[PDB]
Design a binder for this molecule. Sequence first.
Ligand code: CLA
Ligand code: CLA
Ligand code: CLA
Ligand SMILES: CCCCCCCCCCCCO[C@@H]1O[C@H](CO)[C@@H](O[C@H]2O[C@H](CO)[C@@H](O)[C@H](O)[C@H]2O)[C@H](O)[C@H]1O
Ligand code: SF4
Ligand code: SF4
Lengths: 717, 222, 31, 61, 80, 41, 223
Amino acid sequence: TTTWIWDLHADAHDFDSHTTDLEDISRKIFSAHFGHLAVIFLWLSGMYFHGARFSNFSSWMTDPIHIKPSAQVVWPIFGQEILNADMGDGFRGIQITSGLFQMWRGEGFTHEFQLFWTAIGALVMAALMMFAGWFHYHVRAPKLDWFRNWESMMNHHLAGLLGLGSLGWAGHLIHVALPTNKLLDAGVPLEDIPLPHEFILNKSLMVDLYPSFAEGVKPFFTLNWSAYADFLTFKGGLNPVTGGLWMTDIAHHHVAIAVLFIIAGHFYRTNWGIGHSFRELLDDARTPKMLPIFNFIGPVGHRGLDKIFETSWHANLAIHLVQFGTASLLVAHHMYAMPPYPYLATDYATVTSLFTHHVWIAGFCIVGGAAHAAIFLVRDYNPADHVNNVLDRTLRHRDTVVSHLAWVCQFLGFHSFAMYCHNDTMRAFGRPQDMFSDTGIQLQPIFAQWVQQIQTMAVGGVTAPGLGGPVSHAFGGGVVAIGDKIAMMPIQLGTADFLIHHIHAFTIHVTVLVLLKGVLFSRNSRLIPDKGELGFRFPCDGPGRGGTCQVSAWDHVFLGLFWMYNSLSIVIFHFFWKMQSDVWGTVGADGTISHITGGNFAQASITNNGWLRDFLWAQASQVIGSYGSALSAYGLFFLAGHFIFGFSLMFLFSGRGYWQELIESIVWAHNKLKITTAIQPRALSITQGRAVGVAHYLLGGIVTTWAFFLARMAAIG
Amino acid sequence: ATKFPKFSQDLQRDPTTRRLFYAIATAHDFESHDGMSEENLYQRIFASHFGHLAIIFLWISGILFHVAWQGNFEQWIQDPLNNSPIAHAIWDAQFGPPAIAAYTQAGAMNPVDICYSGVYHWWYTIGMRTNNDLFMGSIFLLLLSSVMLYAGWLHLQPRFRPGLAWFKNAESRLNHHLAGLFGVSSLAWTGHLVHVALPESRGQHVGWDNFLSIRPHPEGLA
Amino acid sequence: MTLSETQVFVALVIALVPAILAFRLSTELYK
Amino acid sequence: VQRGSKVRILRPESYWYRDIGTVATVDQSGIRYPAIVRFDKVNYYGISSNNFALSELEEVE
Amino acid sequence: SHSVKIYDTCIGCTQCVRACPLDVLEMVPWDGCKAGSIASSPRTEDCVGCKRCETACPTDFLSIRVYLGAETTRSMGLAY
Amino acid sequence: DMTQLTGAYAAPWLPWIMIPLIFYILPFPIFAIIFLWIERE
Amino acid sequence: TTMSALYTHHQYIAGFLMIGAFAHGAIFLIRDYDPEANRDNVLARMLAHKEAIISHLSWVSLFLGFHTLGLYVHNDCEVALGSPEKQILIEPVFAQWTQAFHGKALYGINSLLSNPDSVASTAWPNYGNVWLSGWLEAVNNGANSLFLTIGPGDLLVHHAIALGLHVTTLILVKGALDARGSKLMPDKKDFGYSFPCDGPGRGGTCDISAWDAFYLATFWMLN
Ligand code: CLA
Ligand code: CLA
Ligand code: CLA
Ligand SMILES: CCCCCCCCCCCCO[C@@H]1O[C@H](CO)[C@@H](O[C@H]2O[C@H](CO)[C@@H](O)[C@H](O)[C@H]2O)[C@H](O)[C@H]1O
Ligand code: SF4
Ligand code: SF4
């Protein structure tokens, strides 16, 4: 039947679904990770090759204020060469929003052969990854005690991967990227920029940019580190030429975290007696050894948990996908407010796209962390290992956890969203004094305003005397302007910011509620006492007990994907409106700031009608008025994303029993004309129809926001 | 068990909240009810049809009453192209003064809704001219609906309950509905059009006080 | 002109007659 | 009806109604559905053979 | 309660009895098939309606049919 | 006229009392009567 | 605003009565239909013809949907890429000639009641078509709303309407003709008009009842 075709592509990469031997499972995982590294190196080879061959990068490096970055040219077939837009400088292409040019300028790239030899090195190292995956599987695969050496793996990845990676990048910053960006910010044209090996061969050429280099590596070994305080600086603020962070703060950052990570890579005991072991740290976290505030975790505590990490790859994937969500969320929030690349903060199409991308990467990773947490509890969890420890006691009060979470989701939905419905009703009545607003009933976010005042008072310098400028200009300080364009200014928080932050707290808590109830009730419940015996992924247990549709832990990941999408859409909508309204814009010749949407977030974002009219209706005029221009691919992708959203609701709202009885009549008509095939035509399964419906829903909604974000910012940003 | 719903004993013994929702959605499915004989099915449908008829007549009686009480029908028939029909008045004590000023529209002195159903254009063509015309039309349908409520109660009484063979008489119904419901009513509507709606279209008031005097035609009925 | 106060009170008193007749039809149709 | 006869189902509730099937065994004990008929097209739940009575079958060869 | 009907096409494979998580079904001697046994449903007031027995039935069409009837506390599967 | 709810029609005190009666005075007694009807045994 | 409100009111009412005609025609086939009292008559024919009616409704549904959406997306990609005269603009010649046969001389094709000396205009044995000289000012004026001028954008939406009529009929006819049973569920008439499913067995049977085909066709009726 046709179900075998869909089941084969779904049974592809789960390895314990075959014969479960952990050493052979761990070897297929270790060599597939080499293959995914070869895919990343092949994709990195493309971005450096298209940056070296199909770009305006040498033209953009002359004057990065008035030149738009392009790195994709389009062939002249079917009339599709209209998308090759003028970027300035006579170059016709597609305006890229990834920010590769701002990344390459800060790293020290100056020509299009340096990007070429980086593309060759990524093409070489991709072939080295698909040899190491062949060698460490088909020739000399390791065995299970090598995979179980946590203390050696933690020591080698803290000190060796992160410590030597950022120390080695601090070598590239100090000897290549600090002189190249110091000459560029002091206005030196690119014929006169020395090639980056001449800052090492001609050592005297770095002496006049940094006089501490004449005194050599000798103050480092004698701990006279204050001699170096002109290329490793604790400045803060932004560069007034580029808008990026100070490159001497970036170098001293990657020096200080290098020492902190190499120190961290000596914490664990491997072969020499010195260090902590993972088992002794976990077997001691229990009563009576903990604090008396934590007496509730009981006498076993964390004692049975090391057998999880001995046996379960899914449980480690659950933690690591969560922390890649934590890292990518930090990358989103910290790179808009402390922009680390030159001429990044005033490229508004790039700041929009970089925040939105790394928010969405983080939200899929968090759902995957909850998905593979439920796979561990169904497949890998053995209850004999966990008697009265913190895993067993969590499963024994799951009714208190879910019902307390269900209450706080209802509290947050009333006391965030229903206050917008209060505000919609009060404004329609003509009672603006009765609204939750800065001019009505104020809800000042006083704890976030207090932190902003602390973050400003810290630099001067009550608690951090070492800075000159602020950590970020979003906290306080002043307006940074690059090319009469705002790079970063203080972001004022009012009643509109109190309300949208409690919307975020509401939509995250519900997304936790869908995912945590799926994990905590994955093995059994009061409804299905043998739910773990039915598997991780199954449609239901029949129409009985009232109806048991979507009880499986897979279907909670299915519902959690919609709620993650609903949560992160409001997050990027909060970002896109507030940056256009209160941050981005133009410093006039008068001295006054005229923002993009003119400061309308404080009064219009407090109702649903203002989000519909002033955000959704007003700002989508660029994407719907793009037909017959160079932004017309965004206008086509805008309607294409609307199509797949409506198309997804056929799979989500219907069931396969209709479609199987519809197929028998078309099977009948194919049999009357004698053209039957052997593989028998089946409707999709109940889980396949849910997986297709959620994939097309998320694809339809994200492509629509992507076309709306990028058509507006490529026109007016 | 509970007494509700009285038509389904298996829903009475339902101990969950499913009992209340399923009692709504099966309340008018008379054939699945407990002990519904096939002749008692037709008699309850017949009385339910009288109840639906009275709701329809009460609905149009309220449209006529609220135009006669709170509308602008006598002001709208002066110039129907420069005026706006009023549906009813607004009483919402949560209104602010900008909402009160915004809905004080179409020449009214209180907040009103603009009628968009077209009943002003329909009553004007068939000869309604005054709010006293719409009021007695609203009172007549207020009594016509109470006749429908009486006939539903009456044809459930044991002497007046019709038997099954009366309900299956598909020749006496199809004759009476073709000639009486479709024919005599279309004949009586022509009698309203030529006696009332055509003289009021030509400036002549014809009401119940002077319709036995005024002929529809100068060559009257000859 | 529109309705008078005696016309509105007549309609309210008359409407008690289909209010009573709908009550006795509802209780006859059943509980 | 015996083994080696390709029969044709007359049962309206069956998946293989008006379809051809090959007889595997026909029992002689006296049970109510003796004709074991094996099939080419599988049904909706992985079954390709089912017992039928002799009165619900018609022969082809 | 629900209604569990066993029809005479049953080959007595005992798979509906093994599949039932509520112990509704048992095998009784029949002499109507080769296995000499047929399924029965004596404790049908414990049936929740999961239809696991119909998923296990190899007969085409199924020899066991579950008809969802009046909902009780047991048939709704309520622990409260 | 423009600051509050008025009525330029006959008996303008009728919506002053009927809308409180219909919408927030009588419903909770009617909901309680209907609740006792559907819970009685 | 009244003409817009009245048209949309009575069309949405009509769409609701249309899907309830098929819903109660499906309740009839489950509850009241007797296969022996209606042996070999027309109601017995379509229940035997049901795989031919549904498959022919499915072809008209797939033909209209492939070619109307294909023409709309083609015209979308031509206007977006700066070439709006490369649109495929099929002139509605059948309903333009139908408008000429009712009295429009706007297309200039001058034949049979767009004609002065036609036999359908003069009414040669009678000369008693008193309606006509008043009728032709309703057709040949530009301010009224009977027999509006149609173009290529009017053809594409009439075929999308024909797509929506045929799919909504296809969901309702297949729900009515498979209401007594299918090969997925042959004893469906003993389960009633409305039931959730038959369980996850036999591949899965979500939305298999005749009630759930009403539920699916209500989305298609509203669309
Ligand atoms: C200091 C030595 C060292 C370094 C640099 C690494 C680095 C890595 N290991 Mg680890 N590993 C080590 C020691 C080390 N390991 C030891 C001693 C053990 C046994 C306890 C392991 C057991 C282990 C397992 C089981 C797995 C890894 C994996 C990984 C990768 C992490 C996932 C990833 O994609 O990273 C992000 C990638 C980067 C940050 C880019 C830099 C990495 C380069 C491209 C690697 C190749 C260059 C070269 C070999 C490293 C520099 C050394 C050279 C100067 C001599 C990363 C390449 C995972 C993997 O993906 O395997 C393929 C994995 O599954 N390691
Ligand atoms: C490092 C990250 C990582 C790794 C190693 C795994 C690995 C695994 N996952 Mg997990 N998972 C992850 C992240 C990861 N996942 C994330 C981020 C999510 C949230 C979405 C999940 C949610 C999840 C679920 C719900 C399930 C798994 C399952 C699995 C296992 C089998 C995967 C398979 O066969 O699919 C093969 C791959 C496919 C079938 C590809 C389909 C992917 C989408 C639908 C298409 C891509 C859309 C594309 C981006 C849009 C472009 C459209 C355009 C081309 C037209 C395998 C162990 C399954 C399992 O069997 O566990 C027991 C399972 O049921 N994962
Ligand atoms: C001539 C005698 C006569 C008349 C006038 C009627 C009239 C009626 N009977 Mg009937 N009936 C009769 C004899 C008669 N019956 C006999 C002898 C029998 C026994 C055989 C029956 C057995 C019977 C049964 C069992 C039932 C009825 C029912 C009905 C009512 C139909 C529902 C309705 O209101 O639609 C009224 C329809 C029209 C007015 C015509 C509508 C035509 C189209 C749809 C519209 C055309 C009008 C126009 C274009 C629209 C303009 C209006 C707009 C401007 C506002 C109607 C009042 C039903 C009922 O409801 O009982 C209470 C019912 O169930 N009758
Ligand atoms: C999850 C978070 C929970 C949110 C809970 C929200 C519940 C409702 C919030 C109201 C409570 C605080 O509301 C506070 O009330 C006072 C008194 O009206 C307001 O006071 C303000 O408006 C009133 C208007 O008459 C004036 O009298 C006063 O001069 C002015 O300062 C403040 O703007 C507001 O900050
Ligand atoms: S429906 Fe479920 S509980 Fe009832 S007999 Fe079948 S398997 Fe047992
Ligand atoms: S409707 Fe579908 S998912 Fe729900 S119980 Fe029935 S078969 Fe299972």
